[PDB]
Amino acid sequence: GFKQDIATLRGDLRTYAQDIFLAFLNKYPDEKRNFKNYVGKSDQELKSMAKFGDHTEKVFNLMMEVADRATDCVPLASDASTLVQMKQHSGLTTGNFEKLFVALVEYMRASGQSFDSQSWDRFGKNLVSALSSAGMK
């Protein structure tokens, strides 16, 4: 289920973080303009960039903590507030996060592993709602 999925993902953290982020960037190539020097590079070129692995892991580490602190796939409002106020997230909108969770859910459904994809979809929708309530446009 959702709780065990967190453990599954944390158990192969680097690989899942990179695969899911790349799935997002490839499903929605427009989203690359939020990042520096990701344009014009294949997945393997991105994975070999300095910062890329470090960044993707730090994002994914926090996403798993937010999922782990949720009850019934409802994230804590305080976690949403932290995500809204981060300087690195200024100018983002909830649409950026909705697209990330669309890509994550699609990746889980296409995977050979048995993820609770509908719970991740609900979690993403509840996170989007919490981000709005916390002030994200």
Ligand X SMILES: Oc1ccc(Cl)cc1Cl
CB contact at 8 A, 94 and 128: yes
Under the binding rule (CB under 6 A), the answer on residue 21 touching ligand X is yes
Under the binding rule (CB under 6 A), the answer on residue 20 touching ligand HEM is no
Asked if residue 47 belongs to a known ligand binding site, the reply is no
How far is it, in rounded angstroms, from Cα 121 to Cα 137? 20
Asked if residue 55 belongs to a known ligand binding site, the reply is yes
Q: Report residue 71: phi and psi, to 5°.
A: -115, 130
Taken in order 30, 87, 79, 81, the sign of the CA dihedral is: negative
Taken in order 111, 116, 118, 124, the sign of the CA dihedral is: negative
In eight-state DSSP terms, residue 71 is B
3-state secondary structure of 116: coil
Residues of this chain, 69-108, that bind ligand X according to CB under 6 A: 100
Residue 20 interacting partner from ligand HEM, ligand X, none (CB closer than 5 to 8 Å by kind):
ligand X
Residue 101 interacting partner from ligand X, ligand HEM, none (CB closer than 5 to 8 Å by kind):
none
- Kindly tell me which residue out of 6, 59, 102, 134 binds ligand X, with binding defined by CB under 6 A: 59
Site residues for ligand X per CB under 6 A: 17, 20-21, 24, 55-56, 59-60, 100
Site residues for ligand HEM per CB under 6 A: 31, 34-35, 54-55, 58-59, 62-63, 66, 83, 88-89, 92, 96-97, 100
